[PDB]
Write a protein that binds this ligand. Structure first.
Ligand code: MET
Ligand SMILES: [Zn+2]
Length: 544
């Protein structure tokens, strides 16, 4: 009955999707699929973050228009997300008419409300190329150790940090020309004006404890005005009434989420939902699944921008940690920096979805993809605990009972134990305590396989006149499988489809209250196969 709008962070258009991105999109998708299972109106949307100096320069280097380049990466990104079954209702772009109009609208409202200031700053400028240089586009000699060819604000030899203006014999990364300091008028967003409102939100109890604690650090350091303009040449939106000035990519980026929803509503011919979800009096819920590296933007700048332009603010922010492989940050040399596209050449999407889900929680701690454990866990839990309930019982039903399940539950009490667990498991999905949900589900799977072993169908099957017993036992196992797959439906979309084909029924959350009795099931190849370390080693090799 609830109206919910969910988004993830918008991936940058100048890079491919990797396992880090996938943790976020998978976490959000599991939550979204669960919400849909409970009957809510859900809108899951995203967009590619396509503006900025890096993108402009990359396109120039490739000899193509930025429009062509971002279009190609958008398609690549969407192919990867589709491959992992991320159920987006809309995937748009920050480079769109919807975002242009909303960005100009919000800026105009902020300016009229007195939240935009003008001030001149001094910045390194490449006079040959004719453009201001962001820090990482300046290279030179470290002022401390004198090591050559260091980029930006830090030295990778001695570890010193400094303003690029301190680099000795500075060179433009773009042209090789010597940059010089040049003045430029910039527009600033008055974030400090929203300090009290933001502090009140921080102590409201909605945000994760770890996020609130971090925000207190930011309030202690002191909020500052935010430089939201960038000079031409740039790839982005030009600021109204300010020739040669553009909105900094980070200003239009989150607005692009609003733009994606407007685009969805417009394509649907829906003229009422946009305002119903974004106006101040909205009763709809808005959630953003994001990584800790962008919390400053989504928890401080974003709510302030919305407040200042008369729009509703996020109902909550769901923050996740970094993704490590084998305990450490992804390493290109070790072949642990894995692309989403590469992953799918070696494993299915469900395997990673399951592993991440089993490790996820409501906290912002990092999630480790230990490859050896990945093989062990997928084989133990998916193949040997859950799918085993179907694979060890389906054969007898199809071969000796014409595919028809028993007319009654052999063990109603045990079945009730399984359905009684729905409340706690659903609450775990709801609260994002994914690891807890998986543990509960697997504990039930253990009870199910214990039941089958207690009944010993491999013994019953060879004994005279025990056909009724065999059908009863195997049917019971299949019904337990039906329940477990329902609880896991948000996690394993593809295996779920195969399970539904086998069971001849769509799995619904409430449906488990009615077991399958005197019901025809279909034969199947193999619902899920084992994986091994040889496959893992091949994945790593292919990633080097
Ligand atoms: C509106 S969220 C933008 C996120 C940004 N593109 C990043 O990857 O960090
Ligand atoms: Zn140095």
């Amino acid at each position: 009955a609830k109206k919910i709008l969910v988004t993830c962070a918008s991936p940058y258009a100048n890079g491919s999707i990797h396992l880090g991105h996938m943790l976020e999109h998978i976490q959000a998708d599991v939550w979204v699929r669960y919400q849909r299972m409970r009957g809510h109106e859900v809108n899951f949307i995203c967009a590619d973050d396509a503006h900025g100096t890096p993108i402009m320069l990359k396109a120039q280097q490739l000899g193509i228009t930025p429009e062509q380049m971002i279009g190609e990466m958008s398609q690549e990104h969407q192919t990867d997300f589709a491959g992992f079954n991320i159920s987006y209702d809309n995937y748009h772009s920050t480079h769109s008419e919807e975002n242009r109009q909303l960005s100009e609208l919000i800026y105009s409202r902020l300016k009229e409300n007195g939240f935009i200031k003008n001030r001149t700053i001094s910045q390194l400028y490449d006079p040959e190329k004719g453009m201001f240089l962001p820090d990482r586009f300046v290279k030179g000699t470290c002022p401390k150790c004198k090591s050559p060819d260091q980029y930006g604000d830090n030295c990778e030899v001695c570890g010193a940090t400094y303003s690029p203006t301190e680099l000795i014999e500075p060179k433009s990364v773009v042209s090789g020309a010597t940059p010089v300091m040049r003045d430029s008028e910039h527009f600033f967003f008055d974030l400090p004006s929203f300090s009290e409102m933001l502090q009140a939100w921080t102590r409201s109890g909605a945000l994760q404890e770890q996020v609130a604690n971090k925000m207190q650090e930011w309030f202690e350091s002191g909020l500052q005005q935010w430089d939201i303009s960038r000079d031409a040449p740039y790839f982005g939106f030009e600021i109204p009434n300010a020739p040669g000035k553009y909105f900094y990519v980070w200003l239009d980026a989150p607005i692009g989420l609003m733009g994606s929803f407007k685009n969805l509503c417009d394509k649907r011919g829906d003229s009422v939902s946009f305002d119903e979800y974004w106006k101040k009096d909205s009763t709809a819920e808005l959630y953003h699944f994001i990584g800790k590296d962008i919390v400053y933007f989504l928890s401080l700048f974003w709510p302030a921008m919305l407040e200042g332009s008369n729009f509703r603010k996020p109902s909550n922010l769901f923050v996740h940690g970094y993704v490590t492989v084998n305990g450490a940050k992804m390493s290109k040399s070790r072949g642990t920096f894995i692309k989403a596209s590469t992953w799918l050449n070696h494993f299915d999407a469900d395997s990673l979805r399951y592993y991440y889900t089993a490790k996820l929680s409501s906290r912002i701690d990092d999630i480790d993809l230990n490859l050896e454990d990945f093989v062990q866990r997928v084989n133990a839990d998916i193949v040997n605990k859950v799918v085993n309930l179907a694979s060890r019982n389906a054969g007898f039903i199809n071969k000796r009972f014409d595919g028809v399940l028993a007319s009654e539950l052999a063990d109603p009490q045990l079945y009730k134990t399984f359905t009684d667990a729905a409340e706690v498991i659903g609450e775990a999905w709801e609260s994002r305590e994914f690891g807890k949900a998986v543990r509960e589900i697997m504990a039930l799977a253990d009870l199910a396989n214990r039941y089958v072993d207690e009944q010993a169908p491999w013994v019953v099957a060879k004994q005279e006149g025990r056909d009724a017993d065999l059908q009863a036992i195997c049917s019971m196992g299949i019904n337990l499988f039906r329940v477990l797959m329902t609880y896991l439906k948000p996690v394993l979309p593809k295996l779920t489809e195969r399970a539904e084909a086998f069971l001849n029924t769509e799995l619904t959350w409430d449906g488990i209250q009615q077991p399958l009795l005197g019901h025809k099931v279909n034969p199947f190849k193999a619902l899920y196969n084992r994986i091994d370390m040889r496959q893992v080693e091949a994945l790593v090799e292919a990633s080097k």
